[PDB]
């Protein structure tokens, strides 16, 4: 489960990194950053400048938001929770 | 279900596209982009410039956020999940 | 329930409108808009300029986000759902 | 539970405050504000300027979003709910 969500999230972010670096001309790190804050809805960056970028972003959000949050709802629920919970046992 | 959420989300986005292109003077694609990132809470754009735009946006958010996320919670839960899940079966 | 969430959300937004119009010097409509997009996490505006504004915003988010989304999870779940659901009955 | 989420959220915010004040050169209050609106996804600020800042932010979001919202889902569910609910009893 967690491993699958791990991989699925990775592929989605790889696609975004490749897309934004190419179409929006961003350095890879900036393309990855944009992909991450966009799918997590933080969105603390300017929007894409090209229409291709805007269209892809619309589809990217609808298809990737569900997956990203599913992974987050496990990275802290089935991994970080025990670490803290089980440790709260004297 | 999914088909209904599909249509309901479409109508909501069509209304936003028409509104922002008219009142905020945005090109249709930009009006659609604003509608999408606003309802998904990504919000990586400047805010509306007119008071009419601000008021509509407030109401648009309250009425559309629930629907948009309901659709997302199906586009990946009752469509993308199987595709990946059932495929994880050797 | 819905009526209570309705009122509770109203009071929270009234407080934000009063605060931002006074401390950040915003016109009431802009103060209301900021309060709304902040609590719904859309956040498509610049941040507060004063430290008082930043501190209040931090507390406002933690205390208001839960309520706002609770109301949204009813404005479309116990009001908009039937309207569309029951109507989907030939 | 609530007390644990309280503390866990505090530590996460302390780390962010220390990181952004040092690496992004922000005044402590601004570093705390950035940490808060980033993890709650409000994101109404410009993005980090350094690559170190961008990388940390990516990891910070994935590891902190789950915790922050878990705490919020209690600050209003197991603390603010009763205060209002039990009080709605004539
Ligand atoms: Na959000
Ligand atoms: Na956001
Ligand atoms: Na945002
Ligand atoms: Na934003
Ligand atoms: Na933003
Ligand atoms: Na912004």
From TrEMBL, chains A, B, C, D:
GO terms for molecular function: identical protein binding; metal ion binding; potassium channel activity. Residues 8-77 form the Potassium channel domain. The chain crosses the membrane at residues 4-23, 52-72. One of its GO terms (cellular component) is membrane. It is a multi-pass membrane protein. Keywords: Ion channel, Ion transport, Membrane, Transmembrane, Transmembrane helix, Transport. Its main location: membrane. It is found in: Membrane. It comes from the Bacteria. This is Potassium channel protein. It comes from Bacillus cereus (strain ATCC 14579 / DSM 31 / CCUG 7414 / JCM 2152 / NBRC 15305 / NCIMB 9373 / NCTC 2599 / NRRL B-3711).
